[PDB]
Design a protein around this ligand. Structure first.
Ligand SMILES: NC(=O)c1ccc[n+]([C@@H]2O[C@H](COP(=O)([O-])OP(=O)(O)OC[C@H]3O[C@@H](n4cnc5c(N)ncnc54)[C@H](OP(=O)(O)O)[C@@H]3O)[C@@H](O)[C@H]2O)c1
Ligand SMILES: O=C(O)Cn1ccc2ccc(F)cc21
Ligand SMILES: O=C(O)Cn1ccc2ccc(F)cc21
Length: 316
């Protein structure tokens, strides 16, 4: 299978990238260095992950040592919710660029459609446990993102965790200058996203699947939760193909024309997770994996369920 997908900005995006949420700062430099050595060319980052400086050390070492050229890398980051105000967007992007030791990002995403009150706290809460919103309209946040393209700080802009009506709002924005290149959403056999994926793809927006392995290290995991990596039905498909369960879970979105960003800090898993370009799931396998949907989310943003722009009340 081809390694990159063409975006609506004319650039090509590697379909497999390395995730970095929860990657400890003392381990993520090694993780990214190993990833680049074994073929990864796309790293998924975010300011809220609190490890971009350490990701940047790895990228810079591999650039300096001429393991890879900058034009061969595809580095993604995301604007956190407390920086939706138009006057804060550039500085937030520039902090990410400084930390990553880059002079541009390949893709910069609005991390969530929900804006929060600015300040030092990433999740400013009130006494009900609900987030303190900001009044900046997302269309205005989008215009600030467009300015980053025109200033050369980012090659492409996109969105994350936007539902179909929110994607539609941008696509219908008065005076829209750049369409979103990507919508990055949770997607795996327990949250298959047929409706939202079809909508985005029909508009030329590439979808990136996050938490493709079901995020077993998510901080709020409970014992009674389902577990993709331990699902015997998925293990059976993996065994039939002589691959690991994780490799099936990564190949699955690839065959839906999605980008996928599995996270690991374990060198052997980083290498294993990339060995997914040499086998094919059958149509029957694909339909069978789709049949496991249960609309089950790792990332439900539960402190924000009353925010006016909370994305997950709508069907898709
Ligand atoms: N836009 C958003 O709002 C958003 C939200 C969630 C995630 N994301 C992005 O998507 C990335 C991936 O999602 P995620 O981090 O939630 O979870 P994930 O990639 O589904 O799962 C990561 C977990 O799987 C383990 N793992 C990795 N490869 C494995 C293998 N071959 N066999 C067994 N276990 C394996 C990792 O362990 P080790 O690391 O210990 O090896 C870690 O515990 C994130 O890191 C982030 O970059 C974005
Ligand atoms: O936004 C993220 O990429 C990951 N994340 C970090 C904190 C957090 C909280 C809730 C959630 F639903 C996802 C979350
Ligand atoms: O908010 C949530 O979507 C899930 N969650 C549940 C407990 C918890 C704690 C911290 C956090 F950052 C997210 C959390």
């Amino acid at each position: 299978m081809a390694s990159r997908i063409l975006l609506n900005n004319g650039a090509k995006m590697p379909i497999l990238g390395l995730g970095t949420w929860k990657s400890p700062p003392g381990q993520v430099t090694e993780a990214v260095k190993v990833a680049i050595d074994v073929g990864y060319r796309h790293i998924d980052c975010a300011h809220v992950y609190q490890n971009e400086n350490e990701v940047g050390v790895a990228i810079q070492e591999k650039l300096r040592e001429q393991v890879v050229k900058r034009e061969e890398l595809f580095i993604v980051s995301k604007l956190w919710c407390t920086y939706h105000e138009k006057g804060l967007v550039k500085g937030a992007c520039q902090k990410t660029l400084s930390d990553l030791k880059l002079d541009y990002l390949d893709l910069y995403l609005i991390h969530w459609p929900t804006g929060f009150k600015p300040g030092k706290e990433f999740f400013p809460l009130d006494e009900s446990g609900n987030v303190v919103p900001s009044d900046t309209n997302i269309l205005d946040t989008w215009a600030a993102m467009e300015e980053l393209v025109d200033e050369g700080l980012v090659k492409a802009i996109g969105i994350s965790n936007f539902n179909h009506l929110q994607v539609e709002m941008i696509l219908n924005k008065p005076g829209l200058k750049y369409k979103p290149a990507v919508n990055q959403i949770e997607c795996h056999p327990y949250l298959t996203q047929e409706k939202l994926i079809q909508y985005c793809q029909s508009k030329g927006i590439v979808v990136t699947a996050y938490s493709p392995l079901g995020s077993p290290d998510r901080p709020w995991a409970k014992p009674e939760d389902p577990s993709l990596l331990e699902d015997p039905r998925i293990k059976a498909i993996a065994a039939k193909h002589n691959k690991t369960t994780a490799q099936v879970l990564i190949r699955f979105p690839m065959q839906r024309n999605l980008v996928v960003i599995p996270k690991s800090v374990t060198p052997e898993r980083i290498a294993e997770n990339f060995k997914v370009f040499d086998f094919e799931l059958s149509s029957q396998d694909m339909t069978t994996l789709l049949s496991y949907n249960r609309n089950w989310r790792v990332c439900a943003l539960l402190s924000c369920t009353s925010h006016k722009d909370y994305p997950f009340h709508e069907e898709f």
